Amino acid sequence: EEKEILWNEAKAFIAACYQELGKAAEVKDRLADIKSEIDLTGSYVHTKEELEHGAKMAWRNSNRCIGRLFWNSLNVIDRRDVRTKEEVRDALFHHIETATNNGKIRPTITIFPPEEKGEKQVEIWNHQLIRYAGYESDGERIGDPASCSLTAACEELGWRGERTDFDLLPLIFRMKGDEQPVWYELPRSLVIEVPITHPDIEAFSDLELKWYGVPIISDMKLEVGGIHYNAAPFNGWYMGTEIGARNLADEKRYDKLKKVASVIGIAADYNTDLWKDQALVELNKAVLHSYKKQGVSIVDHHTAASQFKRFEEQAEEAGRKLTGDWTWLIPPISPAATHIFHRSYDNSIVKPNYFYQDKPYE
Amino acid sequence: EEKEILWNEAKAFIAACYQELGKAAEVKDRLADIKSEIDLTGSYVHTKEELEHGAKMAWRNSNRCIGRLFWNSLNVIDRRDVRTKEEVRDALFHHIETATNNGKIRPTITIFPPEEKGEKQVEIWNHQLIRYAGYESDGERIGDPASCSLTAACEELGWRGERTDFDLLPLIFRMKGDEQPVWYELPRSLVIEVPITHPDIEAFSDLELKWYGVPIISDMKLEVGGIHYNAAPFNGWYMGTEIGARNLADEKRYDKLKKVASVIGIAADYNTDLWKDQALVELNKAVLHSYKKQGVSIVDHHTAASQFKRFEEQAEEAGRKLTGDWTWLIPPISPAATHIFHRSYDNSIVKPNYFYQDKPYE
Ligand code: HEM
Ligand code: HEM
Ligand SMILES: Nc1ccc2ccc(CNCCc3cccc(F)c3)cc2n1
Ligand SMILES: Nc1ccc2ccc(CNCCc3cccc(F)c3)cc2n1
Ligand SMILES: C[C@H](O)[C@H](O)[C@H]1CNc2nc(N)[nH]c(=O)c2N1
Ligand SMILES: C[C@H](O)[C@H](O)[C@H]1CNc2nc(N)[nH]c(=O)c2N1
Ligand SMILES: [Cl-]
Ligand SMILES: [Cl-]
Predict the structure, then answer these.
(1) Which of B108, B111, B136, B158 is spaced 20 to 30 A from B261 at the CA atom?
(2) Which ligand is nearest to the CA of B211?
């Protein structure tokens, strides 16, 4: 059954991929080669062209992603050759460097060897390569609550955080054959951070807020033609609301809205004053302003939605079905000011794609 | 088949309704009476108790409604007795008066005779009893674009609007047996309107914005135990975002955001300035402030969401399933600041309920 599942996905993917690459005539010979290889070995190996286009298709098919217009310019790094933890570490370090690109962020994915018999070759524990630690003890809350369980797992392994609100978590990953993951402190020279200031309100810097420049998601599985790349970190650049409306705003995250209201000089006493809404707007203006000022790529939600409209238009004229998750595509502020809010989307799952997978801690 | 459909819904409704009213023992005798009546007449007549509780249940089951906490205090007016257009007119006038209640809005429904053989007894053309007209000709846009087709239909019938941006549409409805609806101008003494001013920004009154006090939805069908009340206008009070984030903000409605930005003294040139977001917040603060100042009931979206949380809690402890439409329950501004955004809802349709129906014009 596993072999049949693999072969079916392989047939679907190779046909579609080669059609898009104008290589339709080669499909017949390639599929035969694949069928023999699966019969012989239980699996098959993608060509570099297949892997690159597959990672791109998977981004294109990500229903929840508003940034899909740029799917075809994804920078794919093939690291199926790594065998050692030093190599994995250095590949991760390299990804941070090349994706960051001095602030001019390059959308990038680094692809590690895939699962064999469902057996992982490399197992990355980080949610993102750059992420802040979180602590909770005796009612005391420090840093990012969403990082509490990973932080606790790191500290089991001999890591110790400084317990600022912005401790950088180490890289942590496990190799096939090892019972325990290893961890490495991030070289600070690789990590760009942005202090949050406001264009008009000088007092905003009193909050001493900051965020990291590049979100590099490292815990999703890339699936391409029935091959499972559980370890394949990728990045784009941030949409501002991700930071200003969620990471810094949510009560279960950094929960900064009351403090924002105070520094912008409004009362936080009455729902009818819409103080949360006003605070959200100013914090979000601050985030966009700060990233731009530092020369780190970012997009606002209006521009992002305009790009997504073009993605919809592009899909139609290319004759491809559009899929999307309305509930995630709408931005968490002024959603009705975007075209997204006013239409619907088919939420069917199409492969290649990126998928959630179980945490190895917890 | 129609009779079977009716009887099945009747059985389901009477059982549930009488359970809730502690009248479970009476179900057996009532259902027999109903079965005979359907056999004899093709239909059945609700008791006053059944009708009142049915209209309440239908509100409770409205998946898209954030205001459901107060479902049980709905004021039900039984007008199944009306036979003439003067009576219908006067009932509609009465509803406006009693619901308005000098600004202290009473949630109210007036129920007219139901469809017979799918044959309407009274057919109301208005979307709401109080609503502004809309005009479009030679590129010239006046009033509410969403009212353009009804406005045009009214003007076919000899009505003429003054062509201000806030012309009150007349009541328009058709009686069984008539080929044409009749229309009646609304007495202005019945209609409360609210001028939009801002608490801090004096210039806001330069926009000369206003809205009506009470939204009285008059084009949905109430269904109760297989009986179709196509004519049954109802009202609550507004949630502020309905006016400030949609009616006055949408590009296809009054489209006021650029003008709002100008009077609050910000540029409307760059997406990254989040000028639409800031304008939306101030316009919405203005709406809430204005209604409160005039003594007309209104709720903000934060308070409304807090009430809805209590509705969820109430449903659970009463042992009732909760149903909801996430995409409509989230407010169109700062949705992630409400608990609604962070959970999911079962969107199953449960009866009694309110339903859309085809427009008799267009
Ligand atoms: C280039 C800039 C990009 C922008 C501005 C962008 C924007 C976004 C945003 C705002 C989200 C919602 C995230 C959340 O609320 O947690 C998202 C989700 C997502 N994006 Fe993108 N994205 C970009 C690039 C990429 C790239 C390069 C990939 C992969 C190759 C990708 C795949 C996804 C996926 C899989 C999700 C869903 C994650 C989940 O379900 O939790 N995006 N994107
Ligand atoms: C008491 C104050 C009330 C508030 C604050 C409230 C709030 C809301 C809001 C904000 C909407 C969304 C409307 C839109 O975006 O177009 C809504 C929808 C709805 N409400 Fe309520 N509501 C209230 C009372 C009522 C009453 C009295 C009924 C009927 C008895 C009702 C039934 C509905 C229905 C059926 C919808 C869906 C309409 C549609 O699909 O277009 N509500 N409510
Ligand atoms: N700009 C982008 C691009 C791709 C992304 C892909 C994934 C994500 C994060 N999605 C999950 C966020 C999350 C999940 C669970 C807990 C939590 F705190 C936060 C953000 C992205 N941002
Ligand atoms: N406060 C309330 C309560 C109940 C409501 C019930 C219905 C509505 C309106 N829902 C449809 C609005 C609409 C539909 C179609 C076109 C349009 F311009 C506007 C608003 C309500 N507001
Ligand atoms: C938190 C919960 O999953 C919620 O229903 C969804 C709604 N839509 C979202 N949309 C985005 N972009 N990101 C999110 O985290 C969520 N959360
Ligand atoms: C306009 C379109 O129907 C859109 O998908 C929905 C989204 N959610 C909504 N929610 C509310 N409360 N009201 C609306 O008109 C809409 N519009
Ligand atoms: Cl993030
Ligand atoms: Cl309305």
Answers:
(1) B136
(2) 8
- Name which of A257, A273, A334 is nearest B277 (Cβ-Cβ): A334
**Pair B175, B203 in one domain:** no
Query: CB distance from A255 to chain B under 8 Å?
Result: no
Q: Give alpha helix (H) positions in chain A.
A: 2-20, 27-41, 48-60, 85-100, 148-156, 240-241, 257-263, 275-294, 301-317, 326-329
Say which residues have a Cβ less than 8 Å from residue A255's Cβ, sequence separation at least 6: A249
Question: In terms of domains, do A288 and A182 share one?
Answer: no
Which of A157, A168, A101 has its CA nearest to residue A133?
A168
> Which amino acid type is present at position A202?
E
Q: Experimental method used, please?
A: X-ray
Same domain, B135 and B47: no
Smallest CA separation from ligand 6 atom 8, residue: B328
| Cα–Cα distance for residue pair B80/B145, rounded to 1 Å | 34
Indicate if A113 and A144 belong to the same structural domain.
no
Q: Which two tokens stand for residue B63?
A: 């998946």
- Resolution of the coordinates, Å: 2.0
CA atoms within 13 A on the CB side of A30: 20
B281–A288 C-beta distance less than 8 A: no
Residue of B nearest to A291 (CA): B272
Overall number of domains in chain B: 3
A227-229 and A221-224 as β-strands: parallel, antiparallel, unpaired? antiparallel
| Burial class of residue A191, CB neighbours in 10 A (0-12, 13-18, 19+) | middle
Q: Is residue A338 part of a domain?
A: no
A137: helix, coil or strand?
A: strand
Q: E strands of B129-267, at which residues?
A: 134-137, 140-143, 171-175, 182-184, 193-195, 210-212, 216-217, 221-224, 227-229, 234-235, 238-239
In-domain check, residue A203 = yes
